[PDB]
Amino acid sequence: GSHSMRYFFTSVSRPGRGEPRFIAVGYVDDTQFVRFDSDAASQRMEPRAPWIEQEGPEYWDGETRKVKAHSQTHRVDLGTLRGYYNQSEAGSHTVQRMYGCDVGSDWRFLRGYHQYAYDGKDYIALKEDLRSWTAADMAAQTTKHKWEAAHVAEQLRAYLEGTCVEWLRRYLENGKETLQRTDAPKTHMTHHAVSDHEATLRCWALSFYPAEITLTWQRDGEDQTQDTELVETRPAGDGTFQKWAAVVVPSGQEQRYTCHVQHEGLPKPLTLRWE
């Protein structure tokens, strides 16, 4: 099916306590593959997935040189923004940047992204046409005008449509075992008495990949959305994800409830019942 490549960059100023912290991570779909941490001892981009460990030194030296170049532009940006917002030099502030690309199920370029946030809120973003910019803040207007004059969108469009997608395809092929796989959820239910007249039925999906999954309860086939407690999908630590959904069932009514599970790794959607 469809695939994406995304790089996430966070820079946090630390007034007095030295240079800002800078952390970069890269993902293909829901699998992390590289990281760089300004505070770690290597000072290099490092592997986080088995399939990338095989790219050679030209790859690691080049990504380390470019990730360091990003670190430094964010260091300048923290100063440029303090200025644009006339803020104090004593406070910690955060700059975040994400960019990347999506290819459809034919593996052709589908969408590109390039956007920044300052202290948790949207600052500027490249539009879908990859030719124009969205800036909400009056402060952000200076950045937009500068980028237009310097034709920054043309350079990024080139990268998002060519380099970005070409390398996602290469990763998909090289890590086919990890990336082009699907791990179906292993399911079960639990039953626990809340009172003498109600019980909580919890529907569990464990060990699945990718993260996208739909878990729902129905009572006599009617969706119980407002009455289902759902937790956020969470990582197990081994590359798979977990999630649960629970409902409170009045005495004698266990047979009325069904838990439904949709996930790309399943041959067909599951319908489970406590019985």
Binding site: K66, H70, T73, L81, T143, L156, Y159, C164
Partner: peptide, 9 residues
């Protein structure tokens, strides 16, 4: 692979 051109706000 990362974008290789500098960008400053």
């Amino acid at each position: 692979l990362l974008f290789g051109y500098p960008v400053y706000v």
